[PDB]
């Protein structure tokens, strides 16, 4: 505070000019070091450097000092924390990523003065508000500010924020006007089927350029797939849809597939992970794989597809127009009886690059089939998986040999 | 199993009819003093290919000893686990010599060391050698800075043998990584992971890396932390 230039006479000039100038430089260097040293420590924890800058309300200094904070991770407990953060962030022209750990505050306009600043930053691109009490009444405030023409936030993370269906109304309003946002993570909330119904209003809207959407663990059921399916059909920008850890069972996937199979759909990654899927919907997934040439990654772990599901998926995966590159099949309740079809997949598909077979009972004799076929010019350049899957010596030896003989096979990756 | 334990162990390892292939001496309270015996094992053993000696005090004076024999073109060493050995750039010229001459060495793990940019430059002298066959180079917490990106960038397109480069928990920078994106697109053989895990970047860098993975699908994965 004392080291400033914007001061008058009347004994405010009893401090040395030469000392003030040198100390200003020393303080600036001190900030640079601690600002860049973004680690857990007892030294200034980001916000404390801001408190220091707050006292020195000199734009010429603060705007320079703030250029040492490309990534800001701070916790907010009181009103001053917000006033201090607001001041420093507003005068920061080089912050690219911000994380706000709201503590015992939020559900209020209390932080409005901070969010109104983030929306005016021309450098802030990634904002992480996960794992804090940003309940619906708080999200409303943020969504009002995210509609600012100069927002420039492209990635917004809203994980365990305690949001419910109510926030999707405001998120939709943001999606319908904010043309910069590309990634929106709404996972680990309570945005049930209704919340999605509202969210989809923005997702289907022109000028919505969202590319990545995470709806993981959002208490969804197949009822919401009717609206998500429409988004996949119409959206020009949505390529990454993660909807696992939900109750989107076979009746849900069938709905999404009805539109995802459309060859004009822009879906590239489909995160149907812990959706409780059975072989019943694998014929639907097969249809999508056969027709949608834009689908490159499919994640089915946590499901219970069994060998029947694999056979059905293979009908699609083996299709000449299938472009799937990464197929994840970890805990899919698989048995060694599916190895014949997986073995065919490994050498017949020309598009597959990765196959994350994982925590299932694929057997020793089963895996040995992969070794024999992979050696026959398989294009599986990426991981073969087989993690958490325990084998005998001979199988491990064969796999180690395979990696040596076929070095382009990135890694198999056995558990031991 | 301190240095003496190794001195005794090496009696069996150097013995005919010893067909041991994989030996793990990780966290065995070893110092450079034991490297004199391990080096002899590497020289004479017909079967030992996997030697993991990280999490020990095998500092630059230890590696130099192992390298003296590991550089021998007739050595059967394939994987060298010099991980948390407290190495500095001082021994990277020794590692370079091994990489240049020992065509059987396919995996080298140096994470936990403090090699810096000087170490990378020295390693590159060997890695860029036409007879270097190293496939996997692990460089996670090696105390690297963005100043080493020029040499890593060269490595990515000049080496014909490298497949995986696990750059990890270090300060490689945004501008640094962007150099990789530009060169990897130029027919780099790095088919395996690029790394950059635990390393945080800005939006533009992440976007470029995601784009790279889409445009160059044979590049298994970069694998960013977020």
XYZ file of C-alpha atoms in Angstrom:
642
model
C 0.000 0.000 0.000
C 2.753 2.448 1.009
C 4.726 1.895 -2.171
C 2.612 3.867 -4.617
C 2.825 6.894 -6.888
C -0.778 8.066 -6.893
C -0.446 10.106 -3.710
C -0.478 13.738 -2.579
C 1.730 15.880 -0.334
C 0.993 16.653 3.310
C 3.711 14.372 4.714
C 2.820 11.481 2.399
C 6.197 12.275 0.824
C 8.351 11.534 3.894
C 9.149 8.147 2.398
C 12.099 7.857 0.023
C 11.420 7.926 -3.696
C 14.513 5.891 -4.473
C 13.581 3.275 -1.904
C 9.984 3.181 -3.117
C 11.205 2.558 -6.653
C 13.647 -0.192 -5.693
C 11.225 -1.877 -3.323
C 8.513 -1.785 -5.956
C 10.852 -3.811 -8.161
C 11.707 -6.223 -5.344
C 8.041 -6.763 -4.523
C 7.270 -7.331 -8.195
C 9.997 -9.982 -8.469
C 8.709 -11.606 -5.286
C 5.253 -11.910 -6.805
C 6.648 -13.304 -10.034
C 8.367 -16.131 -8.195
C 5.476 -17.042 -5.913
C 2.845 -16.533 -8.613
C 4.654 -18.930 -10.957
C 5.391 -21.389 -8.159
C 1.858 -22.730 -8.278
C 2.193 -25.415 -5.629
C 0.833 -26.315 -2.211
C 2.766 -24.317 0.383
C 2.592 -21.990 3.404
C 3.903 -19.100 1.328
C 1.381 -16.751 -0.407
C -1.411 -19.003 -1.652
C -2.246 -16.997 -4.796
C -5.002 -15.024 -3.065
C -2.524 -13.671 -0.534
C -0.515 -12.189 -3.393
C -3.781 -10.658 -4.551
C -4.361 -9.182 -1.089
C -0.973 -7.513 -1.379
C -1.825 -6.162 -4.828
C -5.214 -5.056 -3.536
C -3.569 -2.724 -1.029
C -1.347 -1.336 -3.778
C -4.184 -0.097 -5.965
C -1.921 1.076 -8.772
C -2.889 -0.175 -12.209
C 0.606 0.268 -13.615
C 2.001 -2.100 -10.991
C -0.880 -4.501 -10.518
C -1.428 -5.060 -14.211
C 2.243 -6.010 -14.511
C 2.307 -8.127 -11.359
C -0.802 -9.955 -12.502
C 0.919 -11.071 -15.694
C 2.708 -13.668 -13.602
C -0.563 -15.493 -12.962
C -1.441 -17.490 -16.144
C -3.392 -19.879 -13.943
C -5.207 -18.767 -10.820
C -6.404 -21.236 -8.214
C -7.971 -19.571 -5.196
C -10.411 -20.326 -2.402
C -13.001 -17.787 -1.299
C -14.270 -17.633 2.288
C -15.334 -14.023 2.785
C -16.373 -10.742 1.191
C -12.833 -9.400 1.008
C -11.679 -12.529 -0.762
C -14.141 -11.623 -3.493
C -13.239 -7.916 -3.519
C -9.556 -8.785 -3.696
C -9.960 -11.460 -6.334
C -12.244 -9.206 -8.358
C -9.748 -6.358 -8.357
C -6.755 -8.489 -9.253
C -8.481 -10.589 -11.891
C -10.005 -7.524 -13.545
C -6.513 -6.063 -13.915
C -4.997 -9.334 -15.109
C -4.452 -9.410 -18.849
C -2.730 -12.787 -18.921
C -4.932 -15.196 -16.967
C -5.905 -18.146 -19.108
C -7.339 -20.483 -16.485
C -9.202 -19.772 -13.259
C -10.441 -22.038 -10.478
C -12.740 -20.663 -7.773
C -12.991 -22.733 -4.620
C -16.044 -21.137 -3.056
C -16.217 -22.196 0.593
C -18.617 -21.405 3.442
C -20.393 -18.479 1.717
C -22.959 -19.841 -1.867
C -26.539 -19.660 -3.307
C -26.484 -15.856 -3.469
C -25.591 -12.648 -5.325
C -22.724 -12.340 -2.843
C -20.211 -13.251 -5.561
C -21.923 -11.327 -8.356
C -19.115 -8.767 -8.316
C -16.628 -11.504 -9.179
C -18.539 -13.241 -11.942
C -19.238 -9.889 -13.607
C -15.462 -9.498 -13.914
C -14.731 -12.895 -15.367
C -17.154 -12.152 -18.182
C -15.146 -9.084 -19.153
C -11.746 -10.772 -19.261
C -10.221 -11.045 -22.690
C -7.691 -13.665 -21.652
C -9.654 -15.996 -19.401
C -10.590 -19.033 -21.415
C -11.000 -21.884 -18.938
C -13.119 -21.546 -15.799
C -13.370 -24.324 -13.220
C -16.097 -24.056 -10.600
C -16.234 -27.727 -9.636
C -16.654 -29.220 -6.169
C -18.051 -26.169 -4.390
C -21.494 -25.020 -3.281
C -22.448 -23.244 -6.506
C -26.075 -24.215 -6.123
C -28.793 -23.210 -8.579
C -29.232 -19.646 -7.077
C -25.498 -19.123 -7.604
C -25.379 -20.595 -11.086
C -28.095 -18.163 -12.104
C -25.757 -15.279 -11.339
C -22.934 -16.796 -13.326
C -25.197 -17.542 -16.261
C -26.287 -13.915 -16.375
C -22.637 -12.883 -16.721
C -21.696 -15.656 -19.179
C -24.021 -14.011 -21.690
C -21.733 -10.990 -21.967
C -20.564 -10.399 -25.611
C -16.949 -10.286 -24.405
C -17.108 -13.359 -22.146
C -14.480 -15.404 -24.060
C -14.792 -18.394 -21.743
C -14.437 -21.499 -23.867
C -14.250 -24.221 -21.235
C -16.550 -24.288 -18.217
C -16.360 -26.995 -15.577
C -19.324 -27.516 -13.261
C -18.728 -30.847 -11.519
C -20.036 -31.484 -8.009
C -21.652 -28.057 -7.814
C -24.931 -29.231 -6.318
C -26.858 -28.090 -9.378
C -30.316 -29.319 -10.229
C -32.773 -29.001 -13.081
C -33.308 -25.335 -12.324
C -29.860 -24.339 -13.508
C -30.412 -25.849 -16.935
C -32.776 -23.045 -17.751
C -29.992 -20.540 -17.318
C -27.389 -22.768 -18.941
C -29.644 -22.989 -21.975
C -29.816 -19.198 -22.118
C -26.017 -19.092 -22.061
C -25.680 -21.710 -24.793
C -28.125 -19.819 -26.999
C -26.112 -16.570 -26.914
C -22.532 -17.431 -25.937
C -20.804 -18.450 -29.148
C -17.424 -19.036 -27.514
C -18.213 -21.818 -25.053
C -17.104 -25.188 -26.431
C -16.778 -27.419 -23.376
C -19.400 -27.716 -20.677
C -18.987 -30.237 -17.879
C -22.221 -30.805 -15.974
C -21.237 -34.121 -14.439
C -21.912 -35.192 -10.866
C -24.994 -33.004 -10.416
C -28.727 -33.709 -10.148
C -29.704 -32.528 -13.597
C -32.361 -35.162 -14.040
C -34.367 -35.829 -17.175
C -36.200 -32.540 -16.887
C -32.949 -30.650 -16.518
C -31.811 -32.187 -19.780
C -35.100 -31.366 -21.456
C -34.386 -27.717 -20.631
C -30.687 -27.947 -21.461
C -31.473 -29.324 -24.905
C -33.272 -26.100 -25.702
C -29.916 -24.352 -25.882
C -28.073 -27.296 -27.405
C -30.462 -27.373 -30.369
C -30.237 -23.602 -30.797
C -28.441 -21.956 -33.683
C -25.221 -20.214 -32.659
C -24.663 -22.873 -30.012
C -21.115 -23.998 -30.689
C -20.753 -26.439 -27.820
C -18.408 -29.289 -28.771
C -17.953 -31.221 -25.544
C -20.752 -32.019 -23.133
C -20.420 -34.087 -19.980
C -23.640 -35.418 -18.483
C -21.958 -38.111 -16.435
C -23.693 -39.076 -13.189
C -26.611 -36.686 -13.716
C -29.388 -38.939 -12.476
C -30.682 -39.498 -16.001
C -32.983 -42.189 -17.328
C -33.947 -43.311 -20.820
C -36.665 -40.660 -20.772
C -34.087 -37.951 -21.505
C -32.610 -39.746 -24.486
C -35.484 -38.506 -26.571
C -34.155 -34.967 -26.232
C -30.451 -35.803 -26.410
C -31.094 -37.763 -29.579
C -32.542 -34.624 -31.156
C -29.460 -32.665 -30.157
C -27.206 -35.211 -31.822
C -29.303 -35.066 -34.980
C -29.458 -31.280 -35.301
C -26.306 -29.958 -33.610
C -23.572 -28.817 -35.970
C -20.923 -28.685 -33.275
C -21.512 -31.337 -30.628
C -18.955 -34.102 -31.093
C -18.233 -35.286 -27.561
C -21.187 -36.651 -25.612
C -20.462 -38.325 -22.288
C -23.570 -39.776 -20.650
C -22.266 -42.675 -18.590
C -22.994 -43.346 -14.923
C -26.715 -42.945 -15.639
C -29.749 -45.193 -16.063
C -29.704 -44.919 -19.830
C -30.335 -48.613 -20.288
C -30.924 -50.429 -23.548
C -34.127 -48.469 -24.142
C -32.112 -45.258 -23.805
C -29.284 -46.202 -26.117
C -31.706 -47.396 -28.764
C -33.166 -43.883 -28.785
C -29.799 -42.169 -29.065
C -28.724 -44.642 -31.744
C -31.788 -43.870 -33.824
C -30.284 -40.437 -34.452
C -26.584 -41.146 -33.863
C -26.703 -43.614 -36.748
C -27.484 -40.731 -39.077
C -24.413 -40.344 -41.372
C -24.692 -36.560 -41.055
C -24.416 -36.662 -37.260
C -21.310 -34.947 -35.878
C -20.887 -37.286 -32.920
C -17.266 -38.402 -32.532
C -17.015 -39.680 -28.971
C -19.837 -41.516 -27.241
C -19.375 -42.043 -23.500
C -22.008 -44.708 -22.816
C -19.998 -46.039 -19.926
C -21.771 -47.189 -16.779
C -25.213 -47.062 -18.359
C -26.219 -50.592 -17.374
C -26.352 -51.710 -20.992
C -26.941 -55.262 -22.103
C -26.512 -57.092 -25.395
C -30.014 -55.879 -26.227
C -28.750 -52.484 -27.391
C -25.584 -53.708 -29.060
C -27.470 -54.163 -32.302
C -28.323 -50.470 -32.026
C -24.705 -49.564 -31.365
C -23.740 -51.789 -34.280
C -26.041 -49.837 -36.574
C -24.417 -46.595 -35.464
C -20.907 -47.935 -35.998
C -21.791 -49.173 -39.489
C -23.362 -45.916 -40.679
C -21.902 -43.031 -38.681
C -18.434 -42.541 -40.133
C -17.718 -39.701 -37.741
C -17.753 -41.893 -34.634
C -14.190 -42.555 -33.557
C -14.409 -43.363 -29.846
C -16.925 -45.558 -28.027
C -16.698 -46.230 -24.297
C -18.791 -49.128 -22.985
C -17.101 -50.104 -19.721
C -19.263 -50.774 -16.676
C -21.963 -52.363 -18.814
C -22.851 -56.047 -18.899
C -22.712 -56.914 -22.566
C -21.191 -60.371 -22.394
C -20.261 -62.361 -25.467
C -23.624 -61.733 -27.086
C -22.995 -58.005 -27.007
C -19.540 -58.420 -28.508
C -20.892 -60.519 -31.355
C -23.471 -57.860 -32.159
C -20.938 -55.036 -31.939
C -18.584 -56.954 -34.217
C -21.235 -57.051 -36.918
C -20.919 -53.255 -37.000
C -17.207 -52.948 -36.198
C -16.324 -55.325 -39.024
C -18.322 -53.206 -41.469
C -16.116 -51.682 -44.260
C -17.449 -48.185 -43.525
C -16.869 -48.325 -39.772
C -14.341 -45.701 -38.688
C -14.202 -46.447 -34.968
C -10.663 -46.022 -33.657
C -11.028 -46.587 -29.941
C -13.264 -49.157 -28.355
C -13.244 -49.441 -24.584
C -14.484 -52.716 -23.116
C -13.281 -52.990 -19.556
C -15.744 -54.290 -17.024
C -18.278 -55.377 -19.634
C -18.864 -58.773 -18.032
C -17.009 -60.543 -20.834
C -15.951 -64.177 -20.908
C -13.474 -66.172 -23.002
C -16.323 -67.128 -25.337
C -16.082 -63.703 -26.977
C -12.429 -64.096 -27.926
C -13.197 -65.631 -31.295
C -15.081 -62.513 -32.332
C -12.572 -60.140 -30.780
C -9.820 -62.064 -32.554
C -11.636 -61.526 -35.838
C -12.074 -57.849 -34.989
C -8.351 -57.352 -34.422
C -7.339 -58.365 -37.947
C -10.486 -57.705 -39.969
C -11.125 -54.098 -38.942
C -8.949 -51.586 -40.741
C -10.078 -48.655 -38.619
C -9.637 -49.890 -35.071
C -6.499 -48.624 -33.366
C -7.166 -49.258 -29.684
C -9.089 -51.934 -27.843
C -9.204 -51.532 -24.101
C -10.199 -54.984 -22.967
C -10.077 -54.794 -19.199
C -11.458 -56.118 -15.948
C -13.248 -59.209 -17.213
C -12.780 -62.996 -17.436
C -11.263 -63.274 -20.887
C -9.077 -66.242 -19.928
C -5.532 -67.301 -20.807
C -6.435 -69.423 -23.811
C -8.659 -66.585 -24.938
C -5.900 -63.963 -24.952
C -3.454 -66.292 -26.671
C -5.745 -66.031 -29.698
C -4.990 -62.324 -29.855
C -1.268 -62.932 -29.877
C -1.563 -65.238 -32.872
C -3.768 -62.898 -34.901
C -2.137 -59.579 -33.950
C 1.142 -60.776 -35.423
C -0.668 -61.055 -38.779
C -0.320 -57.366 -39.666
C -2.982 -56.060 -37.282
C -3.484 -52.293 -37.335
C -4.092 -52.189 -33.607
C -1.270 -49.721 -33.006
C -2.616 -48.655 -29.647
C -3.109 -50.411 -26.356
C -4.565 -53.923 -26.280
C -5.625 -53.451 -22.667
C -6.023 -56.642 -20.640
C -5.439 -54.613 -17.480
C -6.681 -56.026 -14.161
C -6.799 -59.314 -16.026
C -4.545 -61.943 -14.544
C -2.914 -64.664 -16.597
C -0.479 -67.530 -16.281
C 3.211 -67.417 -17.148
C 2.862 -68.671 -20.707
C 0.322 -66.006 -21.619
C 2.414 -63.242 -20.083
C 5.468 -64.562 -21.895
C 3.619 -64.592 -25.203
C 2.397 -61.034 -24.658
C 5.867 -59.806 -23.733
C 7.228 -61.556 -26.804
C 4.487 -59.974 -28.908
C 5.479 -56.495 -27.754
C 9.112 -57.203 -28.673
C 8.313 -58.725 -32.077
C 5.628 -56.170 -32.927
C 7.011 -52.872 -31.465
C 4.321 -50.780 -33.139
C 1.835 -52.380 -30.744
C 2.178 -49.566 -28.250
C 1.569 -51.545 -25.076
C -0.501 -54.489 -24.018
C -0.353 -53.516 -20.322
C -0.813 -56.522 -18.040
C -1.508 -55.891 -14.282
C 1.717 -57.718 -13.206
C 20.122 -55.501 -0.023
C 22.830 -52.890 0.165
C 26.003 -52.764 -1.888
C 27.402 -55.834 -0.197
C 24.222 -57.772 -0.843
C 24.642 -56.983 -4.519
C 28.293 -57.976 -4.442
C 27.114 -61.407 -3.285
C 24.131 -61.522 -5.631
C 26.358 -60.829 -8.619
C 28.183 -64.061 -7.925
C 25.132 -65.957 -9.135
C 24.232 -63.467 -11.851
C 27.645 -63.872 -13.487
C 27.452 -67.658 -13.212
C 26.962 -69.922 -16.195
C 23.537 -71.570 -16.290
C 22.038 -68.460 -14.720
C 19.153 -67.661 -17.035
C 17.735 -64.710 -15.143
C 16.140 -62.199 -17.527
C 14.464 -59.685 -15.237
C 16.057 -58.307 -12.106
C 14.481 -55.679 -9.887
C 16.811 -53.914 -7.466
C 14.543 -50.943 -6.894
C 14.780 -49.270 -3.485
C 17.537 -51.589 -2.248
C 19.649 -49.029 -0.428
C 22.308 -49.140 -3.134
C 25.050 -46.668 -3.927
C 27.466 -46.218 -6.814
C 29.785 -48.648 -5.054
C 27.662 -51.589 -6.230
C 27.717 -50.504 -9.851
C 31.139 -52.022 -10.258
C 29.614 -55.467 -9.807
C 26.371 -54.836 -11.685
C 28.374 -53.532 -14.612
C 30.201 -56.860 -14.773
C 26.892 -58.704 -14.786
C 25.663 -56.646 -17.716
C 28.887 -57.327 -19.596
C 28.995 -61.090 -19.057
C 25.368 -62.188 -18.620
C 23.831 -63.899 -21.628
C 20.290 -63.599 -20.333
C 19.839 -60.446 -18.273
C 17.848 -57.941 -20.315
C 15.769 -56.097 -17.729
C 17.677 -54.237 -15.030
C 15.729 -51.948 -12.715
C 17.918 -50.056 -10.239
C 15.973 -46.872 -9.563
C 15.079 -45.460 -6.152
C 18.726 -45.827 -5.117
C 21.810 -43.636 -4.708
C 23.269 -44.650 -8.050
C 24.226 -41.089 -8.874
C 26.189 -39.913 -11.879
C 29.247 -41.821 -10.673
C 27.149 -44.998 -10.574
C 25.637 -44.661 -14.014
C 29.004 -43.898 -15.563
C 30.182 -47.271 -14.260
C 27.193 -49.173 -15.599
C 27.456 -47.331 -18.915
C 31.074 -48.365 -19.307
C 29.822 -51.919 -19.808
C 26.252 -51.276 -20.980
C 27.677 -49.430 -23.977
C 29.235 -52.681 -25.132
C 27.398 -53.657 -28.377
C 27.348 -57.284 -27.219
C 25.508 -56.439 -23.998
C 22.036 -57.981 -23.737
C 20.513 -55.117 -21.769
C 17.118 -54.109 -23.171
C 15.453 -52.151 -20.386
C 17.360 -49.874 -18.041
C 15.387 -48.631 -15.027
C 17.598 -45.765 -13.849
C 14.610 -43.985 -12.413
C 14.925 -42.147 -9.116
C 18.702 -42.442 -9.024
C 19.371 -38.747 -8.435
C 21.062 -38.364 -11.807
C 22.228 -35.082 -13.249
C 23.313 -33.968 -16.707
C 26.778 -35.173 -15.720
C 25.971 -38.783 -16.611
C 23.867 -38.059 -19.666
C 26.956 -38.173 -21.838
C 27.453 -41.693 -20.490
C 23.859 -42.614 -21.253
C 24.313 -41.077 -24.689
C 27.281 -43.339 -25.350
C 25.198 -46.363 -24.402
C 22.304 -45.317 -26.621
C 24.630 -44.765 -29.585
C 26.403 -48.122 -29.326
C 24.108 -50.608 -27.594
C 21.555 -51.535 -30.238
C 19.773 -53.866 -27.853
C 18.594 -51.094 -25.531
C 14.944 -50.386 -26.212
C 13.615 -48.850 -22.996
C 15.227 -46.217 -20.775
C 13.478 -44.821 -17.707
C 14.949 -41.631 -16.240
C 12.089 -40.102 -14.254
C 12.796 -38.735 -10.786
C 16.208 -37.480 -11.863
C 17.215 -33.851 -12.306
C 18.674 -33.748 -15.781
C 17.376 -30.399 -16.960
C 17.916 -29.112 -20.470
C 21.616 -29.892 -20.354
C 20.851 -33.554 -19.797
C 18.378 -33.614 -22.669
C 20.894 -32.058 -25.032
C 23.460 -34.692 -24.116
C 20.968 -37.540 -24.434
C 19.878 -36.245 -27.833
C 23.426 -36.588 -29.104
C 22.966 -40.342 -28.608
C 19.248 -40.614 -29.366
C 19.752 -38.893 -32.713
C 22.484 -41.377 -33.615
C 21.596 -43.529 -36.706
C 22.327 -46.743 -34.785
C 20.232 -45.869 -31.740
C 17.369 -48.330 -31.312
C 15.720 -46.856 -28.226
C 11.943 -47.160 -28.472
C 10.734 -45.865 -25.137
C 12.218 -42.930 -23.316
C 10.618 -41.900 -20.047
C 11.267 -38.345 -18.882
C 8.694 -37.419 -16.290
C 9.913 -35.520 -13.276
C 13.356 -34.862 -14.737
C 13.360 -31.189 -13.757
C 12.929 -30.108 -17.376
C 12.168 -26.609 -18.611
C 10.906 -25.173 -21.908
C 14.522 -24.595 -22.943
C 14.830 -28.291 -23.801
C 11.949 -28.260 -26.274
C 14.128 -27.388 -29.234
C 16.123 -30.569 -28.741
C 13.109 -32.723 -27.926
C 11.418 -31.306 -31.012
C 14.398 -32.373 -33.096
C 14.311 -35.793 -31.439
C 10.675 -36.335 -32.390
C 11.266 -36.121 -36.141
C 14.943 -37.021 -36.463
C 14.926 -40.321 -34.566
C 13.607 -43.239 -36.567
C 13.594 -45.624 -33.622
C 11.755 -43.702 -30.931
C 8.154 -44.769 -30.444
C 7.229 -43.387 -27.031
C 8.386 -40.283 -25.216
C 6.862 -39.953 -21.792
C 7.424 -36.309 -21.024
C 5.722 -35.747 -17.707
C 5.665 -33.722 -14.527
C 7.955 -30.857 -15.508
C 7.773 -27.218 -16.656
C 7.874 -27.716 -20.405
C 5.615 -24.725 -21.088
C 2.845 -23.993 -23.586
C 5.027 -22.502 -26.289
C 7.395 -25.402 -25.778
C 4.763 -28.068 -26.435
C 3.408 -26.239 -29.460
C 6.759 -26.991 -31.092
C 5.968 -30.684 -30.839
C 2.609 -30.279 -32.501
C 4.180 -28.609 -35.517
C 6.909 -31.216 -35.977
C 4.934 -34.346 -35.067
C 2.622 -33.645 -37.985
C 5.677 -33.968 -40.256
C 5.568 -37.768 -40.426
C 6.954 -38.400 -36.937
C 7.229 -42.088 -36.092
C 6.316 -41.459 -32.464
C 3.349 -43.877 -32.597
C 3.067 -44.115 -28.856
C 2.233 -41.749 -26.053
C 3.636 -38.219 -26.176
C 3.034 -37.752 -22.465
C 2.706 -34.257 -21.052
C 0.787 -35.752 -18.142
C 0.580 -33.760 -14.900
C 1.568 -30.821 -17.096
C -0.978 -28.044 -17.350
C -1.437 -25.811 -20.371
C -3.643 -23.066 -21.735
C -6.614 -23.524 -24.046
C -4.737 -23.024 -27.301
C -2.169 -25.690 -26.470
C -4.831 -28.183 -25.432
C -6.790 -27.408 -28.583
C -3.728 -27.965 -30.743
C -2.987 -31.270 -29.019
C -6.575 -32.456 -29.433
C -6.437 -31.408 -33.069
C -3.139 -33.247 -33.468
C -4.698 -36.463 -32.188
C -7.565 -36.104 -34.678
C -5.315 -35.269 -37.639
C -2.673 -37.852 -36.740
C -4.742 -40.838 -35.433
C -1.722 -43.140 -35.317
C -0.408 -41.011 -32.458
C -1.803 -43.206 -29.725
C -2.402 -40.379 -27.314
C -0.858 -37.287 -25.914
C -2.600 -37.677 -22.551
C -3.075 -34.288 -20.869
C -4.119 -34.097 -17.144
C -7.345 -32.167 -18.018
